[PDB]
Design an enzyme around this catalytic site. Structure first.
Site, short mmCIF file in Angstrom:
data_model
loop_
_atom_site.label_atom_id
_atom_site.label_comp_id
_atom_site.label_asym_id
_atom_site.label_seq_id
_atom_site.Cartn_x
_atom_site.Cartn_y
_atom_site.Cartn_z
N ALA B 128 -2.88 -0.95 -6.37
CA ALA B 128 -2.45 -1.83 -7.44
C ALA B 128 -1.03 -1.47 -7.86
O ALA B 128 -0.72 -1.31 -9.04
CB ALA B 128 -3.40 -1.74 -8.63
N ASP B 151 -3.75 4.04 -7.07
CA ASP B 151 -2.52 4.03 -6.29
C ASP B 151 -2.15 5.47 -5.98
O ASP B 151 -2.18 6.33 -6.86
CB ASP B 151 -1.38 3.33 -7.04
N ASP B 195 -5.62 -4.03 -1.13
CA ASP B 195 -4.35 -4.54 -0.62
C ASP B 195 -3.71 -3.37 0.12
O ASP B 195 -2.95 -2.59 -0.45
CB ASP B 195 -3.46 -5.05 -1.75
N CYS B 252 -0.42 -7.90 3.68
CA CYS B 252 0.86 -8.60 3.60
C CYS B 252 1.55 -8.64 4.95
O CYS B 252 2.79 -8.59 5.01
CB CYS B 252 1.76 -7.93 2.56
#
Lengths: 88, 324, 188, 177, 66, 87
Positions: B128, B151, B195, B252
RNA sequence: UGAAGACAUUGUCAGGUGGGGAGUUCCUUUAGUCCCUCGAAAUUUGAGGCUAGAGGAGAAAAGUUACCACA
């Protein structure tokens, strides 16, 4: 004029007792407490400190007895914890 | 010929010889040229509306009242607001400082609506770093439940804590943990979110170092690390819950080692995972076979997002279900 | 008694601010009512409970607390000076409690309470129209009806349904103002 | 995640009560039956729900970063300071409010004390030094501070005269980026 | 008052040694960078971006590479 | 505003080229550690510069993005900021 | 004897944390064995193990800053 904490003033035996005096720096300890209901009374105590002493003697005695009842409840939890530690 | 095309593309766009060859392969030739325009081209700027303090219309009216030219973007989002021109800087507006709106990208939106976060639900985020995803998830549970922000870098954590406490989240704990170690710490969540650290080919406008500084060695260790990252996501979620909880895999990158290969490795190693329709409104299906290797046909349900079709960053979204 | 005496004191202090030289003395004194609206807000429940509202060119000396509540609640949501400069949470909370006043009130006080609040919406409009529509509802925290401050309650989360309860109230008179309330609401 | 002791408890609620009107809603049992509890991490205190506090006990103490909403910081001399992180609950049930105009709203965001020429409207019953929480027209919480002068004395100063002090403002979220 | 009398009589002498050490700090930092000059001009073997350690930690790491 | 520079003239001792490349950050000002924090550009001050336009190939076939550069002029006296790459 | 009701609740293993209670006085930086173990890759990597160059009166409070306000 200097702060009293900086001066190494020995503790005097007044009407308020000295208790057992802890050495300075060498294994000085402290205590630990959070509570739920007694800390609710600490809320009740601090507006009474913030709004000042009550002119009504009945309400001032009533709010002092609530703090006394909180200390009695907090003490009874402390002996309950001591009994639990003795059992364990 | 193909060889003349590779040398001309690497010369004029400045890509590395390897990564241009990989990206040329996954596209038809004229589709590759339209993709190389967009990913180098800067992307539109998008705004997420805090549902807690404001909503779409009154924030929009407020920013035009401060001179900001907006437009509601798409029928996809009831939460998104595109910006076109602004006399005042976007971070300068007192609506920003209260936390009425947050700067995001489009690709930060869609994993959150891929998830379906409900009230009083324990959720998670293994990475995050900008904190936009975490603030979006808390907007959906309406300040309930608990989010475990994670993180592995303390420097990004300061921006996380600044962004979270401005937005008024009040329900997130942030830990500086390697997320491979995270199911050993707690486990037993409803809706986990990941992510992963990725190669970054999906967004070159923000990070133009991937043009050359990404080689053969980096394409082995980095998808390797997503695997241990992703197997931890199943091993941390709950097989059953009062409200059914799902994993979401968001990268991504547009690479094929980073995307559609890791999900094949996860669904093979753990048979207690299924993949169903991911709930995002549009997208492109994943490829069932790329280079002689077959993936299970569940990847037709996965959605891939591309700079040339949509003005969004390159993205992969896939959602998992836990069985046992 | 005490409900009336506060209400006698209520339109009094609202009249001193209503002084033209005293509003010109807003920059020549602090005369501020934000302490006093909070007194009315916490007493809107107690004023709703008391059925002594109606009893047997004057600004203060009116006997009935129905008109005293009106001249109060006119001066709070519709000031003479700075008519459109009103805080939003004060509009959301006082209109929501006005719906609660619309529940426990006699008939004559109801229409004038009704006949006041179109004028509130017709002058303010979209600033209060977020409540009636659920897409315009903020989702910060659950509504607290018994709060010590006007901004303490968060009425943007709750929508208004007591307009439905007033259709169930006598149709001939009350329902008229309701359609007038909703027609001016759509006309905005 | 050490919870506060007796001495530390009176300090945090004291300066809270110099800005708060109803101390009982903050520590109140809610519908789920779980309350809001105060812990402290790395000499700064946090205001959190008890359940999320309970599952926060799994993270290692000098490894956990932050938790819920930061009320403020314990200073080295034992006093307590408020941060703008405390503002969402502080503006929820504030006791004295100040409205400033749009040409005075951005000064607070840049960090100036409130001057007479920017105030939109005041509240009464403010002593010469009382804590207050500032908004714009839209009641958007902008910060908190102490009134510079009393109900009468603050206005009889010049229109260039400071009317309310700056303590903390929302612009500090723009720093740690 | 014993402490106050000592810095009474020292006074300027503290200022003189203070000015000398900050100029010594200037000299060593310039000389440290000059060692980095002869380092890279003679050899090297670096990264793409550059190390996030601050100075006198980073530069000591490059001196340890000798 | 008028005392700020975002670009510096940087010389590369190899290939003997000077170009304009952006300043990324100020690493150390040896005159004052305070001046390092605000980023005061004085003589012999090391800055980080974008060496993307050069395309110098590092080890392992990678293109550099940020190098050391020592400021070799007195930018308070003459407007231009001049530097040499530490390569 | 009635209600809730297979919900809780309960206990045992395997863990996380533990500024609290009782006693008590190894890690960090770097390289190699590319040797062993676990991973990953159409054959080469990553993470642990091992080895070697350099460091070490005790929750009451301590050292430091070309820093801030005050005297």
């Amino acid at each position: 004029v200097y702060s009293e904490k900086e001066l190494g003033i020995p503790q005097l035996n007044t009407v308020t007792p000295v208790g057992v005096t802890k050495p300075k720096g060498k294994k000085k300890g402290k205590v630990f407490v959070d509570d739920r209901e007694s800390m609710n009374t600490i809320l009740a105590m601090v507006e009474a400190e913030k709004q000042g002493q009550i002119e009504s003697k009945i309400m001032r005695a009533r709010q002092l007895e609530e703090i006394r009842e909180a200390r009695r409840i907090e003490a009874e939890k402390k002996e309950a914890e001591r009994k639990a530690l003795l059992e364990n | 010929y193909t060889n003349q095309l590779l040398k001309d593309i690497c010369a004029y766009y400045g890509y590395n010889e390897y990564l241009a060859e990989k990206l040329l392969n996954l596209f038809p030739p004229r589709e590759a040229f339209a993709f190389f325009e967009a990913n180098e081209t800067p992307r539109p700027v998008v705004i997420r509306t805090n549902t807690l303090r404001t909503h779409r219309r009154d924030l929009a009216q407020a920013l035009i009242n401060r001179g900001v030219t907006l437009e509601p973007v798409g029928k996809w989002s009831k939460v998104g607001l595109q910006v076109f021109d602004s006399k005042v800087p976007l971070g300068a507006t007192p609506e920003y400082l209260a936390g009425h709106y947050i700067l995001q990208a489009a690709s930060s939106f869609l994993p959150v609506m891929a998830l379906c976060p409900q009230e009083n639900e324990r959720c998670l985020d293994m990475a995050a770093a900008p904190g936009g995803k975490t603030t979006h998830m808390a907007a959906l549970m309406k300040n309930t439940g608990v989010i475990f922000a994670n993180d592995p870098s303390k420097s990004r954590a300061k921006g996380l804590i600044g962004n979270i406490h401005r937005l008024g989240v009040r329900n997130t704990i942030v830990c500086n943990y390697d997320a491979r170690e995270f199911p050993r710490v707690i486990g037993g969540f409803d809706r986990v979110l990941l992510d992963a650290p990725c190669s970054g080919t999906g967004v070159i406008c923000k990070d133009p170092s991937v043009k050359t500084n990404r080689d053969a060695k980096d394409f082995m260790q980095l998808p390797h690390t997503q695997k241990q990252l992703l197997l931890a996501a199943i091993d941390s979620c709950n097989h059953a819950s009062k409200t059914g909880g799902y994993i979401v895999y968001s990268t991504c990158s547009v690479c094929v080692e980073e995307n559609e290969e890791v999900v094949n490795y996860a669904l093979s190693r753990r048979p207690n995972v299924k993949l169903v329709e991911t709930g995002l409104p549009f997208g492109k299906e994943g490829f069932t076979s790329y280079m002689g290797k077959t993936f299970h046909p569940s990847l037709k349900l996965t959605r891939r997002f591309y700079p040339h079709l949509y003005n969004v960053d390159g993205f992969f979204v896939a959602k998992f279900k836990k069985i046992g | 008694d005490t409900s009336r005496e506060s209400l006698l004191c209520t339109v009094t202090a609202f009249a001193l601010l209503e002084g033209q030289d005293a509003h010109n003395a807003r920059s020549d004194l602090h005369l501020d009512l934000s302490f006093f609206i909070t007194n009315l807000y916490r007493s809107l429940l107690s004023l709703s409970l008391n059925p002594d509202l109606e009893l047997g060119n004057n600004k203060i000396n009116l006997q009935t607390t129905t008109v005293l509540l009106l001249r109060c609640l006119t001066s709070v949501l519709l000031p003479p000076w700075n008519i459109r400069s009103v805080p939003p949470i004060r509009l959301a909370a006082f209109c929501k409690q006005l719906m609660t006043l619309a529940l426990q009130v006699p008939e004559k006080s109801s229409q004038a309470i009704l006949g006041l609040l179109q004028d509130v919406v017709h002058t303010h409009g979209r600033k209060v129209a977020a409540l009636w529509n659920t897409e315009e509802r903020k989702g910060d925290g659950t509504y607290k009806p018994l709060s010590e401050t006007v901004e303490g309650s968060n009425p943007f989360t709750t929508t208004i349904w007591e307009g439905e309860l007033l259709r169930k109230h006598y149709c001939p008179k009350v329902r008229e103002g309701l359609k007038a309330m909703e027609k001016e609401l759509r006309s905005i | 995640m050490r919870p506060l002791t007796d001495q530390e408890m009176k300090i945090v609620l004291d300066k809270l009560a110099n800005y708060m009107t109803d101390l009982k809603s903050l520590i109140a049992p809610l519908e789920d039956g779980d309350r809001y509890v105060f812990r402290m991490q790395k000499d700064r205190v946090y205001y959190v729900k008890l359940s999320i506090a309970n599952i926060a006990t799994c993270v290692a103490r000098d490894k956990l970063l932050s938790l819920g909403t930061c009320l403020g910081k314990m200073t080295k001399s034992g006093k307590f300071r408020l941060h703008i992180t405390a503002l969402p609950i502080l503006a929820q049930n504030a006791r004295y409010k100040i409205w400033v105009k749009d040409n005075g709203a951005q000064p607070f965001l840049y960090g100036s004390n409130i001057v007479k020429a920017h105030v939109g409207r005041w509240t009464e019953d403010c002593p010469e030094h009382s804590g207050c929480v500032v908004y714009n027209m839209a009641d958007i919480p902008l910060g908190f501070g102490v009134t510079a002068r009393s109900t009468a004395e603050a206005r009889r100063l010049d229109p260039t005269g400071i009317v309310c002090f700056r303590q903390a403002d929302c612009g500090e979220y723009l720093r740690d980026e | 008052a014993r402490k106050q009398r000592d810095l009474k009589k020292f006074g300027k002498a503290v200022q003189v040694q203070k000015q000398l050490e900050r100029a010594k700090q200037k000299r060593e930092a310039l000389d440290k960078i000059n060692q980095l000059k002869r380092k890279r001009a003679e050899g090297g073997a670096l990264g793409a971006t550059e190390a996030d350690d601050p100075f006198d930690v980073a530069v000591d790491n490059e001196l340890s590479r000798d | 505003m008028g005392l700020r520079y975002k670009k510096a003239n940087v010389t590369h001792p190899t290939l003997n080229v000077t170009v304009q490349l952006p300043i990324l950050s100020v690493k150390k000002n040896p005159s004052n550690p305070l001046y390092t924090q605000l980023g005061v550009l004085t003589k012999g001050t090391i800055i980080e510069v974008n060496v993307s336009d050069l395309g110098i190939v590092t080890a392992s076939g990678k293109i550099a993005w940020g190098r050391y550069a020592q400021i070799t002029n007195n930018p308070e006296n003459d407007g231009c900021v001049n530097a040499v790459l530490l390569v």
